[PDB]
Design an enzyme around this catalytic site. Structure first.
Site: not given
Ligand SMILES: [Cl-]
Ligand SMILES: [Ca+2]
Ligand SMILES: [Cl-]
Length: 294
Positions: A37, A107-108, A271
Site C-alpha cells: 500500500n 509492506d503488504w 518506508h
Molecule cells: Cl497500510
C-alpha cells in the site's frame, strides 16, 4: 538509475472474473516483486532492470491497485487481506511460476509474500525483503510521528482521510520517501486513485488490516504463523535494512535479524525505500540471485 518510466509492458489476465495487470519480462525462474500500500508494480521500476537476464522478472498489481480492476461493488468489507490473497494466489497460479521462485517483497507485499512462501515452501528458492511486516505488530513498533495517523485510519475518521482526501497516496507516501518525487512519479502513484470514493478503498482497507495489538485476529495469526516459520526456515534470505527506516526497526528488526541463512545490507530510506535507493537495492537483489542461480 532513477527515472519515472515504468519497467516493461503491462500485461493483463482474467482472474476470478476480474482483470489483473502485471509485468512479466524475460525467461527462466521467476524473480517475483510484490508491492504493498498504496503503490503498484511501478514501485519496482528502477530495481527490476538490475535483474535483467537473471530470470523471469514479474511484478503484479494487487486487485484494486495499479492497472488491476476495482472490485465491484466496493465497500468497507472489501479488500481485506483474505480477499487480496485469493486474487494474488490465483494470479500466481495462473502465471505458471514453477518451483524455484525468488520473492522480493515490501509492506503488504511482504505479508502476502511471506504467507505464500510458508504455504509453498518447496517452490521458494530465496526471499528478499525490506520494510516488511516480520511478525505481528504493536503500536510501539510505529514511528512516533506516524502512529496517530494509522490509528486514525483504524477509526471512523478513515473514510474522510482516505476515500475523500486520498491521504495515503498524497501524504503518507511522499512523507515516507526522503527524496522529492517528480510530477510524473506522483502522477503514476495517483493514477489508480484519481477519483474520490470507492476507487480509493484499497488504501483504507489496508491500514485497517494491519496486524496490530492482536487485531484483526486472522491477519495476526497468519503473521504469527510465518514469523515462526521464517525464524526456522533454511531458505536463503536477503534483508535490506533501511536508515532511518520506518517499519522494520527496533523490535521487529531484532526479530528478523534472528532469521537463519540471511544476508543483510543497509540502504538510505524511510518506508518506500525503493524511491530512495533503487540502485543499491537492485544491485543487492541481483547479487543474491546470482549466488542462488550459479
Ligand atoms: Cl497500510
Ligand atoms: Ca518526502
Ligand atoms: Cl527448473
Amino acid at each position: 538509475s532513477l527515472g519515472a518510466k515504468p519497467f516493461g509492458e503491462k500485461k493483463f489476465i482474467e482472474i476470478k472474473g476480474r482483470r489483473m495487470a502485471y509485468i512479466d519480462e524475460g525467461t527462466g525462474d521467476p524473480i517475483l516483486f510484490q508491492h504493498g500500500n498504496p503503490t503498484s508494480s511501478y514501485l519496482w521500476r528502477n530495481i527490476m532492470p538490475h535483474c535483467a537476464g537473471l530470470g523471469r522478472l514479474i511484478a503484479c498489481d494487487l486487485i484494486g491497485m495499479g492497472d488491476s480492476d476495482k472490485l465491484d461493488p466496493s465497500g468497507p468489507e472489501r479488500y481485506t487481506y483474505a480477499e487480496h490473497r485469493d486474487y494474488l494466489d490465483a494470479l500466481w497460479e495462473a502465471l505458471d511460476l514453477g518451483d524455484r521462485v525468488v520473492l522480493v517483497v515490501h509492506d503488504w507485499g511482504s505479508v502476502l509474500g511471506f504467507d505464500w512462501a510458508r504455504r509453498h515452501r518447496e517452490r521458494v528458492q530465496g526471499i528478499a525483503y525490506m520494510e516488511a511486516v516480520t511478525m505481528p505488530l504493536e503500536w510501539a513498533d510505529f514511528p512516533e510521528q506516524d502512529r496517530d495517523l494509522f490509528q486514525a485510519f483504524r477509526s471512523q475518521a478513515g473514510e474522510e482521510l482516505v476515500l475523500q482526501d486520498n491521504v495515503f497516496v498524497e501524504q503518507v507516501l511522499p512523507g515516507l520517501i526522503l527524496r522529492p518525487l517528480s510530477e510524473a512519479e506522483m502522477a503514476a502513484y495517483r493514477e489508480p486513485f484519481l477519483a474520490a470514493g470507492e476507487a480509493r478503498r484499497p488504501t483504507l482497507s489496508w491500514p485497517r488490516q494491519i496486524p496490530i495489538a492482536g487485531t484483526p485476529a486472522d491477519v495476526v495469526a497468519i503473521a504469527r504463523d510465518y514469523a515462526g516459520w521464517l525464524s526456522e526456515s533454511p531458505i536463503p534470505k536477503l534483508f535490506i535494512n533501511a536508515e532511518p527506516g520506518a517499519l522494520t526497526t527496533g523490535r521487529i528488526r531484532d526479530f528478523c535479524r534472528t532469521w537463519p541463512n540471511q544476508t543483510e545490507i543497509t540502504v538510505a530510506g524511510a518506508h518506500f525505500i525503493q524511491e530512495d535507493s533503487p540502485d543499491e537495492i537492485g544491485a543487492a537483489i541481483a547479487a543474491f540471485v546470482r549466488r542462488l542461480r550459479p
